Design a protein around this ligand. Sequence first.
Ligand code: XL0
Ligand code: XL0
Ligand code: XL0
Ligand code: XL0
Ligand code: XL0
Ligand code: XL0
Ligand code: XL0
Ligand code: XL0
Ligand code: XL0
Ligand code: XL0
Ligand code: XL0
Ligand code: XL0
Lengths: 68, 68, 68, 68, 68, 68, 68, 68, 68, 68, 68, 68, 68, 68, 68
Amino acid sequence: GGGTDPATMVNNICTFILGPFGQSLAVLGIVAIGISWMFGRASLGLVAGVVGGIVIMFGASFLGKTLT
Amino acid sequence: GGGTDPATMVNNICTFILGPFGQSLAVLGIVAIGISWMFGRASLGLVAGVVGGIVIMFGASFLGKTLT
Amino acid sequence: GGGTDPATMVNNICTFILGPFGQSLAVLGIVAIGISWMFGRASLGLVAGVVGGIVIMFGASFLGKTLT
Amino acid sequence: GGGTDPATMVNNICTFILGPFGQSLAVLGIVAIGISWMFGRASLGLVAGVVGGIVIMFGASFLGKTLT
Amino acid sequence: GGGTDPATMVNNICTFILGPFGQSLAVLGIVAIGISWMFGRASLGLVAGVVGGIVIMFGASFLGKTLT
Amino acid sequence: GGGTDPATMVNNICTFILGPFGQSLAVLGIVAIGISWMFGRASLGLVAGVVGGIVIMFGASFLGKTLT
Amino acid sequence: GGGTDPATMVNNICTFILGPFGQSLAVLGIVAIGISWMFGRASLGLVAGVVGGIVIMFGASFLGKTLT
Amino acid sequence: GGGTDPATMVNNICTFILGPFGQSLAVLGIVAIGISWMFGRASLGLVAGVVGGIVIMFGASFLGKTLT
Amino acid sequence: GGGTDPATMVNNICTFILGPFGQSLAVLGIVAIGISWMFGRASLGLVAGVVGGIVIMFGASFLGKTLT
Amino acid sequence: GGGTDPATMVNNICTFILGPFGQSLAVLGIVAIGISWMFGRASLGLVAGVVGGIVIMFGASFLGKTLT
Amino acid sequence: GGGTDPATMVNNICTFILGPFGQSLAVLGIVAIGISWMFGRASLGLVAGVVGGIVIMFGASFLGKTLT
Amino acid sequence: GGGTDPATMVNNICTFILGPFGQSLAVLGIVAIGISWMFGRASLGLVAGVVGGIVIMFGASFLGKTLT
Amino acid sequence: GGGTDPATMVNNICTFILGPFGQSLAVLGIVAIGISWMFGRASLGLVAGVVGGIVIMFGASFLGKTLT
Amino acid sequence: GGGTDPATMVNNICTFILGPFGQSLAVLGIVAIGISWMFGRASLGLVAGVVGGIVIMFGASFLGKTLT
Amino acid sequence: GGGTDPATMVNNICTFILGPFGQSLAVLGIVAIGISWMFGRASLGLVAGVVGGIVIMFGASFLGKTLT
Ligand SMILES: CCCCCC/C=C\CCCCCCCC(=O)OC[C@H](COP(=O)(O)OC[C@H](O)CO)OC(=O)CCCCCCC/C=C\CCCCCCCC
Ligand SMILES: CCCCCC/C=C\CCCCCCCC(=O)OC[C@H](COP(=O)(O)OC[C@H](O)CO)OC(=O)CCCCCCC/C=C\CCCCCCCC
Ligand SMILES: CCCCCC/C=C\CCCCCCCC(=O)OC[C@H](COP(=O)(O)OC[C@H](O)CO)OC(=O)CCCCCCC/C=C\CCCCCCCC
Ligand SMILES: CCCCCC/C=C\CCCCCCCC(=O)OC[C@H](COP(=O)(O)OC[C@H](O)CO)OC(=O)CCCCCCC/C=C\CCCCCCCC
Ligand SMILES: CCCCCC/C=C\CCCCCCCC(=O)OC[C@H](COP(=O)(O)OC[C@H](O)CO)OC(=O)CCCCCCC/C=C\CCCCCCCC
Ligand SMILES: CCCCCC/C=C\CCCCCCCC(=O)OC[C@H](COP(=O)(O)OC[C@H](O)CO)OC(=O)CCCCCCC/C=C\CCCCCCCC
Ligand SMILES: CCCCCC/C=C\CCCCCCCC(=O)OC[C@H](COP(=O)(O)OC[C@H](O)CO)OC(=O)CCCCCCC/C=C\CCCCCCCC
Ligand SMILES: CCCCCC/C=C\CCCCCCCC(=O)OC[C@H](COP(=O)(O)OC[C@H](O)CO)OC(=O)CCCCCCC/C=C\CCCCCCCC
Ligand SMILES: CCCCCC/C=C\CCCCCCCC(=O)OC[C@H](COP(=O)(O)OC[C@H](O)CO)OC(=O)CCCCCCC/C=C\CCCCCCCC
Ligand SMILES: CCCCCC/C=C\CCCCCCCC(=O)OC[C@H](COP(=O)(O)OC[C@H](O)CO)OC(=O)CCCCCCC/C=C\CCCCCCCC
Ligand SMILES: CCCCCC/C=C\CCCCCCCC(=O)OC[C@H](COP(=O)(O)OC[C@H](O)CO)OC(=O)CCCCCCC/C=C\CCCCCCCC
Ligand SMILES: CCCCCC/C=C\CCCCCCCC(=O)OC[C@H](COP(=O)(O)OC[C@H](O)CO)OC(=O)CCCCCCC/C=C\CCCCCCCC
């Protein structure tokens, strides 16, 4: 009919999230951490969490390859 | 007629989930944990759950063999 | 129907927060740090946190680009 | 008799939800998140969920196209 | 029979919440933050959350338009 | 039946909190700050928080009008 | 026989719930929120929910008229 | 048969909770706040919550009348 | 069956806590404040909190009567 | 035959639950709250719930009479 | 057949929990509070909760008798 | 089947924690307090907490006996 | 035919669960609590639940005898 | 058919978790505590929880034997 | 299918965190402690925590081996 590879679809999701959409998300994540420092009180834990989340999320393909 | 081994079919499901489809799923799992840290607050429990789920899911054949 | 790019929407959020709205937020952040010194006791840590938050929040696009 | 394309009807639902009705829903979603911050306590997770839901819901056509 | 536009109804909800009812809610929000400072201890985070919630809730139409 | 304007009710809450009940609350707030200085150690931050909370809470209508 | 307007009956339910019975319910709602603060810990969210529920429930006729 | 006014029953609940039973509850609430200061550390927020809960709970009839 | 007044039970709790059990608790509270000064550093705030808690807890009946 | 009053049977259930069986249940309820404080962390809400449940359960006859 | 008093069974549970089993539990509760001070930081609240839980749990019969 | 006394098991836990395992824990507790003084700043409160925790934890049987 | 005592079968289940199979289950329960502390955050409640479950499960015969 | 001892399977799980897989888990637990100190602030409680979890998890067989 | 050893995967995580990724993390940890001294006030406790975290995190394999 009009089907496609399930592997292709999940790969499309990986492609979309790690494309320009992910770059815009990364910008908003840095915006959020900036505001949290701004109208709250600065902390090393919060910047570590946000930056670490960005590193983990964009490294998902390579982190998955290392996990095999 | 046109039948096949039920054991072969269940083995095909094991083959498919642990093939490229599982690798793409593993990438999306790391994407999800990255975003959860990103727009939430980082926690060791959540990364342990996601990474442990990936380890369990790809180790299913070997974990099953150990269970005999 | 009436949809649009998800990437465009997240880019619109980046545009809005870093536009005149962010400038007004930056003013209020400097207001808050001024009052904290004013009716409290001055400290280098608090001004560093507020100013650093402003630098991080407006530098989000460029900080994200450096993170790639 | 008086039938029509099932594809047209489902496309009409996509058109209606993403039209002015969706814009009004988007306004009420931002109203709800504003009140939740207002009479509760502000959190980055809740604004991320509401804004992300709006992005996902209006991006449904394009997200579906990427999924093919 | 006696129906009406669903878009009109959702627009009526937007009109009602952002009308005099929202102004009275905004007053009570400032009352709540005043009492929290009053019988608790003052903090910049709590006033930022309450004021930000008011800004978000009344800006819902314009924030939604920017999200398109 | 026996309903009334929701706007009237929220306005009644604004009227009640800012009436004689608020004046009595304001007295107790000054009592609390006096005792905190009394059996603790005097500080400018605590009096600023309590007095600022009273100013914010009674100025809620006018602060809300300025926020429009 | 001995029938009546279904519209009258539903209007009677609206009349009864919004009459003295609703006033007594409103008193018990304020009793419940008082006890929750009393033998628990005070929170702005819980008073907002209870008071908002009272406002919504007595404003049902007018809220319904606005929805048309 | 042996029925009675539902309004009377809800009024009976209001009468019972605000009678001698409520006075005994008020005593236990002051006992609880005293012990919390006693074997913990004193705070203005906790006494405000307990005392405010007592004021709200006994003022339920009058608070409800003001809400109309 | 074998029931009793709920008011009597709550009054029994008031009687028990304010009886010899409360006197023994008062002794342990003074023990705790003595040790805190002993193996820590003396402060007027801590003795005020403990002594104030004892005064509040034993004065609960009379404090409740004043609140009416 | 060998029937009896349904009212007598329901009254027998009221008699049994409020007799020595209820006293033993009351002891176990205080045991449960003691252990919850013991191997958990003490809270005023939990003791209020357990003690309030005992007061409500033994006051059922009198609470029902007040409800008429 | 082989039944027994439900009151006896609930009394047996009261007997068992308050017997040597409860004494051993009391020892472990003091062990837990000792370790919490040991590998954490000492606090009066935690010892009050654990000791109070032991007092409440072993006093359940007498506390229940006072509640009648 | 293969059961045993619940009292014996809880007594076994008391035996194990207060045996050589507790002695090794006591050594590590003194190690921790030594390092806290070492790479921090010495304080009488911290040594009192750690030593008091050891005294409480090993005295659990005798402290429980005194509580009866 | 080939039947047996229903009492024997239920006793066989009691024998099997409390035999070597229960010992292996007890080991896995301690494994689970160790990992929960390990990749989460330690808490006294969770160890109390797991250890208490083991005590209850192996004490089932004796706990049942006490219940008669 | 192709069955095996349920006791053997649960023993296999005990063998697997306490084998090389557990050693690798122990390494990751020490990694996690190191990072928590690293990008957060050092605390004795967190290292006690992680190390205690490792001790409990690998001691599960012997801890279970002591519980009998 | 496409599975692998769960032990290998957990060992891969140990390999990845302790490889070049850990070296880069170690650099950022020293960066963070430098900035904390820089825009705050120097303290021996904070450098001890950060350096100790690095020592613990890279020593995880050897610390785990010592724990056996
Ligand atoms: C593309 C870069 C994205 C990061 C933006 C960096 C730019 C720029 C980052 C730094 C820009 C601001 C510099 C001044 C900030 C400051 O000094 O603020 C004073 C506040 C005072 O607050 P308070 O009174 O409450 O006391 C809290 C403290 O106890 C006492 O000080 O102290 C702090 O908060 C701690 C300092 C945090 C430093 C974070 C650096 C992170 C860099 C890098 C971190 C690397 C994260 C690694 C993540 C893991 C990756 C696997
Ligand atoms: C051949 C082995 C098959 C099993 C695979 C084991 C491999 C490997 C199993 C473990 C591999 C992952 C280790 C890290 C997992 C983790 O730490 O995740 C954090 C999440 C955080 O989530 P959240 O925020 O929602 O809070 C939920 C909790 O309250 C707070 O933590 O915590 C948990 O979920 C609890 C931990 C469950 C541990 C299960 C071990 C089962 C082993 C053995 C179980 C034996 C089962 C016995 C069955 C009965 C037999 C008769
Ligand atoms: C074509 C793409 C279609 C998917 C749309 C993705 C676009 C875009 C997807 C992401 C766009 C929104 C980003 C921000 C969302 C957010 O951060 O919200 C905060 C809320 C806060 O709520 P709360 O307080 O209740 O706490 C709940 C949590 O415990 C604490 O956070 O946290 C969450 O809900 C968890 C985050 C879910 C992330 C889902 C990503 C799925 C992507 C991909 C998933 C792949 C699915 C694979 C399916 C299987 C396939 C075989
Ligand atoms: C229509 C205006 C509505 C706001 C009312 C402003 C009027 C008036 C606002 C200010 C009126 C009071 C001035 C004095 C308050 C004070 O100095 O209190 C001392 C307390 C002492 O407490 P403690 O001992 O616990 O130590 C806590 C601190 O660490 C040490 O000080 O310090 C503080 O709390 C921090 C100061 C907060 C300042 C908030 C200003 C917000 C303005 C504007 C904020 C803009 C919010 C933007 C939201 C986002 C929008 C997108
Ligand atoms: C007829 C009026 C009915 C309401 C009764 C008002 C009377 C009277 C209402 C106020 C009477 C009590 C005043 C003192 C209460 C107090 O200060 O308590 C300290 C506790 C401390 O607890 P903790 O340690 O856990 O920390 C929790 C906080 O983070 C730190 O403080 O702080 C609070 O709980 C927050 C304060 C809530 C204020 C609610 C006002 C609602 C009014 C009006 C609300 C308007 C609701 C609008 C609903 C929506 C309508 C569309
Ligand atoms: C004619 C208007 C009819 C609606 C009545 C609105 C009037 C008035 C509506 C608002 C009047 C009450 C305002 C204060 C309510 C409040 O703040 O309560 C605190 C409780 C605290 O509870 P808790 O502790 O359990 O934590 C739960 C939350 O996680 C933490 O907060 O928080 C909430 O519940 C979330 C807030 C819900 C806001 C709903 C607004 C809906 C409006 C509009 C919705 C639009 C619906 C669109 C439907 C789809 C249409 C296609
Ligand atoms: C019938 C009266 C019932 C109240 C009992 C009053 C009797 C008597 C009330 C007062 C009797 C005790 C007086 C001395 C208490 C004391 O000084 O303790 C020192 C502790 C030290 O602790 P720490 O080291 O942790 O530092 C915490 C602080 O930051 C530093 O000090 O400081 C405090 O806790 C703050 C002081 C709270 C004062 C509360 C008064 C409430 C009155 C009235 C409140 C009105 C409540 C209004 C509710 C809303 C109504 C709508
Ligand atoms: C026959 C009497 C039955 C009750 C047993 C009373 C005996 C005796 C009752 C008291 C015996 C113990 C006294 C010391 C307990 C303690 O101080 O513990 C410290 C813990 C510390 O924990 P954490 O660190 O987590 O911080 C939690 C708090 O925020 C900070 O403290 O603080 C608490 O838990 C709050 C104190 C609760 C007090 C409950 C009294 C109830 C009495 C009476 C209640 C009346 C109930 C009315 C019910 C409704 C009736 C209609
Ligand atoms: C003849 C009277 C019959 C009623 C018995 C009242 C006697 C007496 C009723 C009250 C006697 C007990 C007083 C103390 C109870 C308590 O404070 O418990 C703490 C628990 C803690 O639990 P947790 O940790 O899980 O957190 C759950 C909450 O989120 C945090 O607190 O909090 C609660 O449960 C909420 C309080 C419920 C109050 C119900 C009052 C109903 C009265 C009246 C209700 C009117 C009902 C109207 C029905 C509709 C009629 C049309
Ligand atoms: C059979 C007895 C069982 C109890 C064991 C007592 C033996 C022995 C109990 C005492 C043995 C140790 C004595 C030295 C402890 C110490 O001084 O530690 C310093 C730490 C420093 O920590 P940090 O820096 O974090 O600052 C925290 C403080 O703010 C500053 O100090 O200060 C404390 O923690 C407060 C002191 C608590 C005292 C508790 C006594 C309870 C007795 C009796 C309590 C009675 C409980 C009543 C319960 C309710 C009953 C209804
Ligand atoms: C022959 C005796 C049979 C019973 C075995 C008792 C032996 C022994 C029974 C007790 C043995 C274990 C003691 C320690 C258990 C524990 O403390 O666990 C911590 C968990 C933590 O879990 P979490 O994080 O999810 O938070 C859940 C809670 O909110 C926070 O704590 O807390 C609990 O679960 C509540 C405690 C339940 C206590 C049940 C006692 C029942 C006795 C007697 C009950 C009587 C029953 C009456 C029935 C009605 C009769 C008419
Ligand atoms: C194979 C060994 C695994 C452990 C690694 C040990 C190696 C190495 C462990 C030690 C390596 C680092 C040494 C310097 C650390 C330091 O001094 O940091 C300063 C920070 C400053 O932070 P802040 O400003 O926030 O103030 C927090 C404090 O209040 C003030 O200081 O102080 C601390 O955090 C307390 C010190 C914790 C010491 C933990 C030792 C655990 C050992 C052994 C613990 C035994 C655990 C037993 C578990 C139970 C077993 C049944």
